[PDB]
């Protein structure tokens with residue numbers, strides 16, 4: 001279930017984080033504009049750039065902490081507030097987060113593995129609700 | 138405290154994992170015999186290897202999960218059993234684990250960050266006890 005999926009992802013967090021983040025950019029290529037240093041770089045080039053593996057791992061670490069603090073896939077409002085208030089997220093809207101979760105769920109469904117994809121979709125939906133409540137447009 | 142420290146480490150895991158693992162190898166250089174291609178290299182050479190940082194991160198990803206699943210610094214027996222049964226750990230004894238935790242605690246005490254080093258000492262001793270209860274020599 002969802003708690004085991006947090007353990008699966010955490011066990012190899014850097015690999016999964018890079019794979020899901022690239023699935024997100026490759027499904028929604030216009031999102032790459034937010035990461036000016038990733039423009040024009042192949043997947044293997046990105047994995048040679050310190051900030052790429054460090055960015056993706058730190059993003060997914062925080063995602064897993066939010067996921068683990070949730071109850072029945074409902075995240076804490078304080079965690080949504082952290083995400084809205086980050087200076088790096090100041091220009092984003094909830095649709096940017098929707099796209100990330102659509103890509104994450106698609107990745108899990110296409111994976112060899114028994115992720116609880118439905119729970120990740122519901123977690124993403126509940127997180128988007130919380131982001132909106134916390135002020136994200 | 139210990140639970141916070143798990144979050145601190147996870148928030149910069151590749152850096153901390155490498156630094157702690159290097160502290161272990163430098164304190165106990167003959168432990169390199171269990172690994173491949175580490176001898177004859179300085180810290181910066183190790184960090185630039187293809188597999189070194191990734192290995193440390195997989196180790197620390199799992200270590201942090203074992204810490205997080207613990208209650209009062211007591212690991213789950215099932216986590217000890219997994220560590221004993223891993224083929225990669227087939228030749229180890231509990232003394233190898235004790236040395237890793239001695240180096241980890243020394244690193245935390247010497248760091249500028251406010252770790253609960255005594256709880257990590259206790260966790261390591263409890264992990265050694267659980268590894269022995271699970272059959273490691």
Ligand code: HEM
Pocket residue numbers: 031034035051054055058059060062063083088089092096097100
């Ligand atoms: C639940 C979802 C998300 C989480 C947990 C998250 C978390 C983070 C974290 C922890 C950082 C800082 C990493 C560091 O210390 O280097 C960061 C930076 C950033 N985030 Fe997010 N993020 C999320 C979603 C998004 C989305 C959907 C976008 C845009 C489409 C985005 C755009 C950015 C940008 C542009 C940065 C700064 C990149 C840089 O400094 O190079 N984030 N995010």
Ligand code: HEM
Pocket residue numbers: 168171172192195196197199200220225226229233234237
């Ligand atoms: C709680 C402490 C430890 C944890 C959490 C841990 C975890 C791991 C993990 C996750 C792997 C890799 C599994 C894989 O992806 O293939 C691994 C491999 C390995 N571990 Fe440990 N380990 C610990 C302690 C130790 C100690 C103390 C030693 C020896 C001094 C050691 C020796 C090895 C070796 C030799 C490998 C195989 C490396 C390779 O072939 O690339 N481990 N460990």
